[PDB]
Amino acid sequence: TRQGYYIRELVDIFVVGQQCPLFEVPGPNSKRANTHIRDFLQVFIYRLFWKSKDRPRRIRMEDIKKAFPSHSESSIRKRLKLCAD
DNA sequence: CGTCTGCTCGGCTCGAGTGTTCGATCGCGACTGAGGACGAACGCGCCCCCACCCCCTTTTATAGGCGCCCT
């Protein structure tokens, strides 16, 4: 860590074979992919509103632009359309 | 006037639903090939019947040979 080194011994190590997947990874540009993209952004926006101390709760746009910098700001504008002014 | 944020609108992409076509076994059906059994006709064998020829005797002349019977 930042403060120093720490040492443990280990005695047990597992080898994991070939995985049998139980969850389907979406494809690129899929409907499930884009749904997750906007849902994740919406959850981050709600949790930034919960963390806000001023009443009424207020956030800044460039916090979201620091978190999601590949997003066009139009997508963020629409996620803020419903729930913020 | 420039920047930024939001709102609307347009275009593109992807997913889902449906309908048509084809094949995927397929589940019967038709139909010909393969295989003894029974009845009728023939030829065919077997049996029976018919036909023909000789044997029963008598006679009579006549004679050589073989066998038997009582004198």
CSV table of C-alpha atoms (C1' of nucleotides) in Angstrom, one decimal:
chain,number,residue,atom,x,y,z
A,1,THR,CA,0.0,0.0,0.0
A,2,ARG,CA,1.1,3.6,0.2
A,3,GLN,CA,2.4,3.2,3.7
A,4,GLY,CA,4.5,0.0,3.5
A,5,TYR,CA,4.9,-3.6,2.5
A,6,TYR,CA,3.1,-6.4,4.4
A,7,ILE,CA,3.8,-10.1,4.0
A,8,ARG,CA,1.5,-13.2,4.4
A,9,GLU,CA,2.3,-16.8,3.7
A,10,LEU,CA,0.0,-18.7,1.4
A,11,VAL,CA,-0.7,-22.5,1.7
A,12,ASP,CA,-3.7,-23.1,-0.6
A,13,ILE,CA,-3.8,-22.3,-4.3
A,14,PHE,CA,-6.6,-23.5,-6.6
A,15,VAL,CA,-6.3,-24.0,-10.4
A,16,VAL,CA,-9.4,-23.0,-12.2
A,17,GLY,CA,-10.3,-25.0,-15.2
A,18,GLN,CA,-12.3,-23.9,-18.3
A,19,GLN,CA,-15.3,-21.8,-17.2
A,20,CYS,CA,-18.9,-22.7,-17.9
A,21,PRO,CA,-20.5,-19.3,-18.4
A,22,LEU,CA,-23.9,-18.7,-16.8
A,23,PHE,CA,-24.2,-15.0,-17.9
A,24,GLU,CA,-24.3,-13.9,-21.6
A,25,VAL,CA,-21.8,-11.3,-22.5
A,26,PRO,CA,-23.5,-8.8,-24.8
A,27,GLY,CA,-22.1,-8.0,-28.2
A,28,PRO,CA,-20.8,-4.6,-29.3
A,29,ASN,CA,-23.4,-2.0,-30.2
A,30,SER,CA,-26.1,-4.5,-29.0
A,31,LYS,CA,-29.3,-3.4,-27.4
A,32,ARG,CA,-28.3,-4.9,-24.1
A,33,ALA,CA,-24.9,-3.2,-24.4
A,34,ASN,CA,-26.4,0.3,-25.0
A,35,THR,CA,-29.0,-0.3,-22.2
A,36,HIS,CA,-26.2,-1.1,-19.7
A,37,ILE,CA,-24.2,2.0,-21.0
A,38,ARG,CA,-27.1,4.4,-20.2
A,39,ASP,CA,-28.2,2.5,-17.0
A,40,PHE,CA,-24.7,2.7,-15.5
A,41,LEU,CA,-24.6,6.4,-16.3
A,42,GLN,CA,-28.0,6.9,-14.7
A,43,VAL,CA,-26.9,5.1,-11.5
A,44,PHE,CA,-23.7,7.2,-11.3
A,45,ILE,CA,-25.8,10.4,-11.7
A,46,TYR,CA,-28.2,9.3,-9.0
A,47,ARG,CA,-25.4,8.4,-6.6
A,48,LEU,CA,-23.8,11.8,-7.3
A,49,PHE,CA,-27.1,13.4,-6.4
A,50,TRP,CA,-27.3,11.4,-3.2
A,51,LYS,CA,-23.8,12.5,-2.2
A,52,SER,CA,-24.6,16.2,-2.7
A,53,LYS,CA,-24.8,18.2,0.5
A,54,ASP,CA,-26.7,21.3,-0.7
A,55,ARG,CA,-30.5,21.4,-0.5
A,56,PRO,CA,-31.8,21.2,-3.2
A,57,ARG,CA,-29.3,18.6,-4.4
A,58,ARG,CA,-27.0,19.9,-7.2
A,59,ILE,CA,-24.2,18.3,-9.2
A,60,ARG,CA,-21.6,19.6,-11.7
A,61,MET,CA,-21.4,18.4,-15.3
A,62,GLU,CA,-17.6,18.0,-15.4
A,63,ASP,CA,-17.7,15.5,-12.6
A,64,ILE,CA,-19.7,13.3,-14.9
A,65,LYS,CA,-17.4,14.3,-17.8
A,66,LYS,CA,-14.4,13.2,-15.6
A,67,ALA,CA,-16.0,9.8,-14.9
A,68,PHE,CA,-17.3,9.1,-18.5
A,69,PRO,CA,-15.0,11.0,-20.8
A,70,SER,CA,-15.8,8.9,-23.9
A,71,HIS,CA,-19.4,9.9,-23.7
A,72,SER,CA,-20.7,12.6,-25.9
A,73,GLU,CA,-22.2,15.3,-23.7
A,74,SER,CA,-25.6,15.0,-25.5
A,75,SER,CA,-26.1,11.5,-24.0
A,76,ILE,CA,-25.3,13.1,-20.5
A,77,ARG,CA,-27.7,16.0,-21.3
A,78,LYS,CA,-30.6,13.5,-21.9
A,79,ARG,CA,-29.8,11.5,-18.7
A,80,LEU,CA,-30.0,14.9,-16.9
A,81,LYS,CA,-33.1,15.9,-19.0
A,82,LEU,CA,-35.4,13.8,-16.7
A,83,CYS,CA,-34.5,14.6,-13.0
A,84,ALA,CA,-32.4,17.8,-13.2
A,85,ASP,CA,-32.6,21.4,-14.6
B,1,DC,C1',-20.9,37.3,-29.3
B,2,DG,C1',-19.2,33.1,-27.7
B,3,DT,C1',-19.8,29.0,-24.8
B,4,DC,C1',-22.6,25.7,-22.8
B,5,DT,C1',-26.7,23.1,-21.9
B,6,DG,C1',-30.9,21.3,-23.2
B,7,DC,C1',-34.5,19.8,-26.5
B,8,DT,C1',-36.1,18.1,-30.7
B,9,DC,C1',-35.6,15.7,-35.0
B,10,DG,C1',-33.5,12.8,-38.4
B,11,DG,C1',-30.9,8.9,-39.9
B,12,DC,C1',-28.9,4.5,-39.2
B,13,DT,C1',-28.6,0.0,-37.2
B,14,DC,C1',-30.3,-4.2,-35.2
B,15,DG,C1',-33.7,-7.3,-33.5
B,16,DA,C1',-37.9,-9.8,-33.7
B,17,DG,C1',-41.8,-11.7,-36.0
B,18,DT,C1',-43.8,-14.0,-39.7
B,19,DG,C1',-44.5,-16.7,-44.0
B,20,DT,C1',-42.9,-19.7,-47.5
B,21,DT,C1',-40.2,-23.5,-49.1
B,22,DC,C1',-37.8,-27.7,-48.7
B,23,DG,C1',-36.3,-31.8,-47.0
B,24,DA,C1',-36.4,-35.3,-43.3
B,25,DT,C1',-37.2,-39.1,-42.3
B,26,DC,C1',-41.1,-42.0,-43.3
B,27,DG,C1',-44.9,-45.0,-42.5
B,28,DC,C1',-47.8,-47.3,-45.6
B,29,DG,C1',-49.2,-49.2,-50.0
B,30,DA,C1',-48.8,-51.5,-54.2
B,31,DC,C1',-46.8,-55.2,-56.8
B,32,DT,C1',-43.8,-58.5,-58.6
B,33,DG,C1',-40.5,-62.3,-57.4
B,34,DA,C1',-40.1,-66.8,-55.2
B,35,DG,C1',-41.6,-71.0,-53.6
B,36,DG,C1',-45.0,-76.5,-52.9
B,37,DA,C1',-49.4,-78.8,-53.2
B,38,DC,C1',-53.2,-81.0,-55.4
B,39,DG,C1',-55.8,-82.8,-59.2
B,40,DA,C1',-56.2,-84.7,-63.7
B,41,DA,C1',-54.7,-87.2,-67.6
B,42,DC,C1',-51.9,-90.5,-69.8
B,43,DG,C1',-49.5,-94.2,-71.0
B,44,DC,C1',-48.5,-97.9,-68.9
B,45,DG,C1',-47.9,-101.7,-66.4
B,46,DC,C1',-50.2,-105.8,-64.7
B,47,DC,C1',-53.5,-109.2,-64.7
B,48,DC,C1',-56.9,-111.9,-66.6
B,49,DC,C1',-59.1,-114.1,-70.3
B,50,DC,C1',-59.4,-116.2,-74.7
B,51,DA,C1',-57.8,-119.2,-78.3
B,52,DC,C1',-55.6,-123.1,-80.2
B,53,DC,C1',-53.8,-127.6,-80.2
B,54,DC,C1',-53.3,-132.0,-78.3
B,55,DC,C1',-55.0,-136.0,-75.4
B,56,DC,C1',-58.6,-139.4,-73.8
B,57,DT,C1',-60.3,-144.7,-77.4
B,58,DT,C1',-61.4,-148.1,-81.1
B,59,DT,C1',-60.2,-150.6,-85.0
B,60,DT,C1',-57.2,-153.3,-88.3
B,61,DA,C1',-54.2,-155.3,-90.8
B,62,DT,C1',-48.9,-156.4,-89.7
B,63,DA,C1',-43.8,-157.3,-87.3
B,64,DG,C1',-39.2,-156.5,-84.1
B,65,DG,C1',-38.0,-155.7,-79.3
B,66,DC,C1',-38.6,-155.5,-74.0
B,67,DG,C1',-40.7,-156.9,-69.8
B,68,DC,C1',-43.6,-159.8,-66.6
B,69,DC,C1',-46.2,-164.2,-64.8
B,70,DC,C1',-47.2,-168.4,-63.7
B,71,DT,C1',-45.7,-173.5,-65.3
